[PDB]
């Protein structure tokens, strides 16, 4: 068996998606997401100019050898661009292997561990009354878990308040006050629990903005409202930052949508400083690496909570749902819904019912790409915002 | 898909082997080793009286759910008997999944990572001249790595000196002197290096007999002879025992043929106290658990060194060689050869050439069991020896 | 003195019990419990096919040598099956030694340390009103300590809600929601304290279902109700799991009915992460090992809290009560009462009065087995339940 | 002051170099190296498609704000591609600031700390006699410090044996044996010390190939030869890997040419596990980040040892030599010489005399780019090799 061609498809059916297609000599092909929000073309070059020329002629069944060849062989290891390129290759090869086996991908991984996959949606409001209305709408759509974000008085724009953060040709500049946020946000959760009661799962994304003792304070203030998690409370390049938060609160902690390697989270997990790892298939080297992260996590009670924003394409979502159907220590799947225009480019077998997913019984990850339709939507640059404090300091968005 | 029958086959073609066969409703079947040397019938009861009745009617594709169901559902977790029964089930289910995929098992795991699998053999002598002759014979058979064990002056019988340790209806009683051994064994390695030079890989199995500071002493004494490993130097129920050895020597360390769980070796591995993990598919819950142990090990530079004594059947050896062909952090495969009579009961696809194995290209793990021939050889009890010190103290064999 | 015979008696006077009887050449005999709930016949084989043939002809006075011979000599060490078989031997030999001394067993251990032994009973209800009624009934029976378990709204079946968990030929499948439980259970303890006041000792068994930060949350929520203990809050194969719970709550912690070795709890105890060790004579290698566990525990303020469910036979209960009468760091004895039919098979000297036990003054542990009556009740398989989450995930029962 | 244009120049005068030029509205410009060996075009896209469009119109004097804007604002932080793009910007802005000040760059950093900068060169041979000849030639060129690499018997190709490792359109595949290397390399250093005596500084690059206990063994074997350093002994994604090496040898340790962030080496440095940090201006975010790494290093006795292979352009070398002239804890500068054809494209003020450099007194870093000459040499792909073990395993090159 040999790879005879591989190509990168770039399309913008409402936002940019990058997809790798690998084609074998017996006409089976596989696809993988390669989208890196706000840096997309750097991955297109990484694949087209360096990795694809090496793939040609290789036996696609050699998933592990190819993964190690690219992970170690780049010499400069890890990193968002290289690990997203490698994720695209890895997923496309698992898609091929499952097609060759005539099995849905979750069967290759070890079979199903559950009959349905819990998801969460987003409820965002500019103020508290609008936030409560957004929670009602999310519940009305059948979601049993809801991420709640609310505008803060005295702050113009804040994270998560249809929201699509890559909103401009060059980065938008948001302004931020930590103290205004910490004083106000617990009141939002008190009002949501008063209206909606204790059974609904509530999530909150802090979006990198606090220091550890501020996150400790916030976690304590949110304990009465028993959140499913408090996410990304502090930037995590120094993993020891979470030890102080963990010392002071029992609100469960999630982190890691921005990571690309097990080495970004090994210490967070083995020291039991977090409850959910959010690192994704598309941004951290594919299924091969994420199986290892999830298995490592399971020894320490940590559960998977994959990021699921719209900048992860339906190809990532199909791979993630097959992974979610098998992995023992599944926690939750984020679902920020794609638009109809986006979905049409990526026919898929996964489906949603009453707050839960199943991955679909098609062979492979069950996702394809309509190349003729993708070609109708040329790339259009869109970058993520930056965040400044009130004095102008460039802060964490 | 459903399991319609499952049975335990017990045979003694020279020594006892226990095998599980699981049969599906489309006539595909799978087999797994269930042999637990010197306690074999306890696993036969564990499977026949408790686990098989639950398997019937289950979808065999649900490998992970079935693994967790038995691992957690026993309530009394881990342990040699239950984890060997679960290994037999797990391997038989991976054998079925690979047959359903029409692939050799190593392809399901992620494909091959190497073209051949290094093995080691045993060289045993009653004295130094006979040990040197046994090393010559092992080299003449094409082995590039050799475990060297030698009789010690003033000690009647010592470990590893055709050797088959389960030698009696009830346990044989060996006698041991640590100080006689520590004074003599380095001279054996000096003489082997003088005759055979530096290129041959040399291994030594201490067989549980030392305390940590004695193992530190021995490791230091063996450094000039640059061993591939020093194995099982101290009993390892208290994993911190290896910290003191690691403090004092750079001879590489191996342990773990007797373990049945990742929880027996998590601390040894994450603290970098060992170089090779020896825990096997048959004794530690099958491929599902050993993939997790090997992956965990890889984060800490630890490599696989599966035990490979004759009490692991050819079904274990086939599963181990498919695992060895894929796993990135492969170190070595032990090969204590089965006899012709043993091999005839278990037709297999794996082959040996010039010191190395390949697993074979047959679907599944490539091993089968000839039931009609197995039935010619009824069980015959054989227990492992015990070891006493010179004063009678019951020691570690 | 020699052992001339040893046999395994299996009987089901309402549930399965396995008993070893060792007979000496002067007609003194001893008995030990060998019951391993839901895996019983694997221990019967371990004893009949491997250990008993070695016992014959040995001097029964050599308790320590025989213990080490089996513990080390199995080669594959520890584990539920082997450690329960060894417990049966060890207890039967202590029974013989105390008979030869003409003393109740507690005198051999060092004599009595107390005049009576505190016990606790079970109060279980399907809802809060029924739970309160069960607490009243338990108090009316003279108990000064009561384990309270209550059905949770929105959950069909939960742990501990006459309850006998091995309820079926194959495992029953329970369904579980952690979040429903955590939201409700503190209200049960508030209502029990409001009705019954502060003097009664209250216990709760979490039954393995939480993660560490969830157990930290629950322990904090239960602090106002000053429980005697919160038990088995998280699965404990990774003993470091308790460090995070201990960081966050002063509710006292108990664990360990499922353990079989000191190596399952050494780190829990020496780091002062628990208050009570629950590991039993029958499941952890008998009196010889439990004396060592209790003594180790005493250096770190940990007290004994032996498990005492109905699946530990009256032979275990007699041995446990003699141990309880002597051990300095006694905490409490669980008492889930045997039925009349069960008690008739095992005549015993221990007695209950107003919430407390004494072991009895008969030589040995004071328990015997009526072989003729035992023979009226053939084995009948009964397995423990499994537990699944609402999505189907196989969880901890 | 405003940036009015910025462009990426790609040229291959013997090997590929990528350079950013930033032009201000008063005609001052600055340049920075952006070369990422074997992945070059991914950085060209990162800059052209994402970062340059943001630079236009910014005040170039705002070095720190621009650094934080790109480091945090990418969202996906760190990594070889993004940190090399940011390095190019940072160096070009420091070049501009020093031109605006009319000072050589080292004056802006704090002035000179030394009068000359020690360098080392490479001596490589296919065998020992040729290695000794290469050392003689290196000494004859005036070098006082020499990195020695030698071919190993029984190994075809090994690291560092005019050597330019990016030698092919697609990766060359080298083969490796750790045990052959460990047995032989100490003899090379014994022979170099016998011929050349103790005063010459000797360096060795292990090139990622060992495990920690193998590196401990090698460091001990090299102690008699008192090396300046042993470099890159083990892959360092798990920084704790160096703790075991440090436990066992006093040979000084260097690592880090492949790192891109302080977070790749914080633990190596603060625990005193290394002696020299090798991370470079071009690959780790420029002067702004490297000042912080070097200052952090100084608290723990760690000295700078910048990588200096030919794939770091003369623009990197000029920036590195100005940094080297100022930084207090300077250790050494690697110098793998550029060819005449390479040097002609990048006129520069730094000079070499008798083994040492000075950076030059021109304003800025003293390096420029001849755009007309650069345009004569179009890009030509060249990738770094990969390394396989003798069985085919994809290993660390
Ligand atoms: Cl990157
Ligand atoms: Cl067991
Ligand atoms: Mg987020
Ligand atoms: Mg061994
Ligand atoms: Mg309990
Ligand atoms: Mg180097």
Swiss-Prot record, chains A, B, C, D:
Enzyme Commission identifier(s): 4.2.1.-, 4.2.1.8
Keyword Magnesium attached: yes
Catalytic activity entry: D-mannonate = 2-dehydro-3-deoxy-D-gluconate + H2O
Keywords: Lyase, Magnesium, Metal-binding
Cofactor(s) the record lists: Mg(2+)
Positions of the catalytic residues: 159, 207
One GO process term, biological-process aspect: carbohydrate catabolic process
GO molecular function terms listed in the Swiss-Prot or TrEMBL record: magnesium ion binding; mannonate dehydratase activity
Binding site for Mg(2+): 205, 231, 257
Cofactor note: Binds 1 Mg(2+) ion per subunit.
SMART domains to which the protein is assigned, alphabetical: MR_MLE (SM00922)
A Pfam family annotated for this UniProt entry: MR_MLE_N
Residues where substrate binds: 37, 122, 257, 278, 307, 311, 334
Function statement: Has low D-mannonate dehydratase activity (in vitro), suggesting that this is not a physiological substrate and that it has no significant role in D-mannonate degradation in vivo. Has no detectable activity with a panel of 70 other acid sugars (in vitro).
UniProt cross-references to PANTHER family, sorted A to Z: D-GALACTONATE DEHYDRATASE-RELATED (PTHR48080), STARVATION-SENSING PROTEIN RSPA (PTHR48080:SF6)
Family to which this protein belongs: Belongs to the mandelate racemase/muconate lactonizing enzyme family. GalD subfamily.
Protein name: D-galactonate dehydratase family member RspA
